[model samples]
Target: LTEQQRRELDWEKTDGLMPVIVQHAVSGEVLMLGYMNPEALDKTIESGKVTFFSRTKQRLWIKGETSGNFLNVVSIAPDCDNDTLLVLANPIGPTCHKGTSSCFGNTAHQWLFLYQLEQLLAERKYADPETSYTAKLYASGTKRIAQKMGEEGVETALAATVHDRFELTNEASDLMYHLLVLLQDQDLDLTTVIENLHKR
Candidate 1:
């Protein structure tokens, strides 16, 4: 919603306050939840930082004001009822005061490495092919990349059939990396793959 639309939300349902759920933009995991009065809501949107009505302090508080783990705002949306908000942002550091990746638990970062891999491969698209293996794969075109992906898939399957977990893990990583390159080569993303599976 625009700033005006965000301000017009039905705050009375929550007694002039609403819950805002912050989610990690890359990992797609819930980071934390806090309440926001109308002022807090407008401040959060206007400042591009998640500011919440500190129920304990009785004032507006920007997340990471002292800790420096700012939740850089990417996008925001309201639930169908307009009584709740969802904010997607990139976390600068551990989101929990207890020093975990999320306020919920430490497991929210399992896929973050994969997200980084995708990001690196995305950058490789413009990198010099002679220097970066991923860039070389990109310069080789889809057919070559797809062939390597297929070969890696077969190697991974073969390793899985054997007793060597090490080879299987290595082969699987190779397969996944090539698959990411192929996805980017085709102008797709891992998020789309996950969405397709979600439809099931």
Candidate 2:
């Protein structure tokens, strides 16, 4: 951020402190929350790491300073009120001290399972086709993968039109799975796709 932009934050409104929410850069999971005074925010922006004002310690604290699970920041933006900050970062390891991905618990991140599946599919891309169905799809070539995605899309649409809730859900799952396969086949990922959607 530019020096001019740094001055724009309404520090006085929050008594010289802003609540910062750290989120997974790619998966969009809420990892943790922190309070940052201007000095802490300045250090975070300057160092490209997450820093916060510890209310209990009454001093600045760098996250993962001792655990080596630092949050490498991607972007930082203020809320519309400019009283809160949202920080997108890539976590190096378990975000919570309890060894969970997030302080909110694993259940809070179940919605981001697609990212986990994407990582799995990427790993399976180089596996033996005979042993891995995803590898078989990769071996079949991009045309076949695209065709499967198209077929699944049609099946999903047909299921929806038939008013069969169970069929629709199942077909939709198939459609999404095939879509992910196609994406990986083309060396793409859901994060890039979601970024495109975010632009729209």
Candidate 3:
């Protein structure tokens, strides 16, 4: 196995059990929590999926191994307690042992950031001229704005390879602005994109 696999099998030297919390790396969602004994940890490392010592079953249990809802490891960190661990992963499906997205029960963050982006996009499309750049892009008509956006995206991608931080930042900003303009032209919003992603 690998160094990571080896680490997992290594005894924690704690009270024979290590508390582990699993979280989603990209979305910053907490998935589940359980305890791992050396054997359980070994199974998790070997399989590249999380496993917990079944306090009830008295054996190692691989989470989502049978159901195809495995959590792909991103990174793992030890808590200040040292006896506890925080594991970041990208889950294929739900993380709960009960087959839910999370073990914490149901309570969503209400997605404020996405809602704000959607509202801003709508504001731009309506060309409420005094405030947003999106409105300006809509007023400029689709073809000319889309052409400019496409050119800006190319320039930004090229700038990403450069060593100058300031230039890269400027180019990235330009690229983002152009992308927003393009979205406005296409009558597309971030919510629509997110909804499509959920279908996947």
Candidate 4:
């Protein structure tokens, strides 16, 4: 962040601290809640990780200071009323000490079907030809699968340029299927690709 935009959150409203909400920057999930005083915020900003003013501990507490699941910060912002903070971060591992992805737990229905599809493709790596088209693609090997991905990419682009929404959707879907299978051929998955994207 630029020095000119350095924020001054209203801590007096909360008696020398403001609530900080941490979120996964990539997946947009709420990870945990913290309390931030100036000292804690300064430490976090200087260190490029989250540090909270612990109400119980009555001191600065760095998230993952001991467990090593550091919430590498992306951005930190105070809310409209200027009393609460919203923190965007990339967690090195599960954010909770009890070993969970987020402190809030899984109360929300997430879009996990793509990962399921990835697993299905992985499972079909050794499946028979009779019941699965994916198995047949796998058996056909890397070259054709990669070529099909290229073809689908071209088709998707063409659909974007001159075709209707349904055609665009169909072509994009085909592209993703081919892309996933090709990724399977290379022994990687969507999460790895997503992390690569985060780097980019």
Candidate 5:
């Protein structure tokens, strides 16, 4: 699309500022949203990076330029209303100023559990065993580890009773950990799973 078409779409009658939603290109995760005036939009297009009109600073600002977590622009699309922009980019590091993966912070309960499981798997892979369950599993070798994972899956399925939602959730977390361990044992990575989902 031409620059004029882009500019005309964002031509607000009163404010001259348009809302820009920043989304992760691959995962489709919404990182953050910010406002952009004409100058900011121009800078963003010119630099091939994400730049926002900072209300507090009253000027154009490139995201994470100084912090080294620069957002490398992938694509930009406008909404049907022509008053908003969707910016898809690849972020080098944390998107939030507070060092979070996204500006929304740690909101996903399931994601938090998965992160914990990842830590456990890492510990099992690297550190020396000291009675940790994950460590013990790692020491048992692949076959035993896979068998325990299968057992955990069965137990989790059995724990899905009507009156015990919390317990069921905990059981599901356990199942996930076992599955993650099995994946580690087979030299598989979670990114591949994510890519598979993206294909759908």
Candidate 6:
């Protein structure tokens, strides 16, 4: 919500406070829950970090002031009722004082690696020739990458037939990396591949 809309929230219903849910900006994981009064909300906006009304201590508290794990605010929006807020943030370190990623628990899923890999390959696309094999593959052009991917596929299949688990695993990894490079060549990404899977 805009500052005006946020200020206009009916905070009187909750007796000068409303709940705010903090989330990881990139992963979309809910990080923690906090309470915000008008002063705390204003301070949060002004500081660009989450600040909370410490009902426990009866004062305004800046999150991570002691821990150094500040929740750097990306954006904030109100729920339909205007009684709750969803804050997207990029945290500097583990959000919890206990050094965990979230207060609730770790919600880190395995599939996030694919997204991470896609981003890495995207950067490698622009890298110098001697710097990265992925960049060299891109420089080599589409046909060579496609051919290498096809070769890896055959190697993977042959490995499977021969029960050579190590070769199968290695070849599979090669195939995936090559395909990612190919996708970058075509100006597409893992999200595009997943969207097509959704269509099927």
The runs of at least 3 residues in candidate 4 whose Cα sits more than 4 Å from the true structure, single-residue gaps closed, are 1-7, 107-141, 150-171, 181-200
Q: How well does candidate 4 match the true structure, expressed as C-alpha RMSD?
A: 5.3
Candidate 6 per-residue lDDT over residues 11-88, each given as its tens digit? 987788989999888776678889999999999989999999999999999898888888899998988878898899
Among all windows of 10 consecutive residues in model 2, the one with the lowest summed lDDT is: 103-112
- Model 3 over residues 1-200: C-alpha lDDT tens digits? 34654465435466688888898776566777888887877677667788889889898887775787888777767754456778888888766667557767665455534444555676667667566766766777788787887888777777777667787788877776666657757877554666799999
What value of lDDT does candidate 3 attain over all alpha carbons? 0.71
Tens-digit per-residue lDDT, 27-65, candidate 4: 677887888888998899999999998889788988987
Question: Mind giving the per-residue lDDT tens digits that candidate 1 earns over 1-200?
Answer: 67566766888889988999999886787888899998897788789999999889999999998899998899989988788899999887778887667766546557777976897898889988897999899999999999999999899999999868999999999999999999999999898998999999
lDDT of 6: 0.86
Task: Score candidate 4 by lDDT.
Answer: 0.82
Residue 197 Cα positional deviation in candidate 4, in Å, after optimal superposition: 10
TM-score of 6: 0.59
By descending TM-score, how would the candidates be arranged?
Answer: 2, 4, 5, 1, 6, 3
Report how far residue 50 has shifted in candidate 4, in Å: 0.6
Clashes of each: 0, 0, 0, 0, 0, 0
Q: Where in model 2 is the C-alpha error above 4 Å?
A: 1-17, 55-59, 80-83, 109-111, 126-144, 160-165, 197-200
Give lDDT per model, in order.
Answer: 0.87, 0.87, 0.71, 0.82, 0.77, 0.86
Where does model 3 exceed 4 Å of error?
A: 1-14, 97-100, 108-200
Tally clashes: model 6.
0
Query: Which candidate tops TM-score?
Result: 2
For model 4, the run of ten residues with the poorest summed lDDT:
1-10
- TM-score, per-candidate, Cα-based: 0.61, 0.73, 0.50, 0.65, 0.64, 0.59
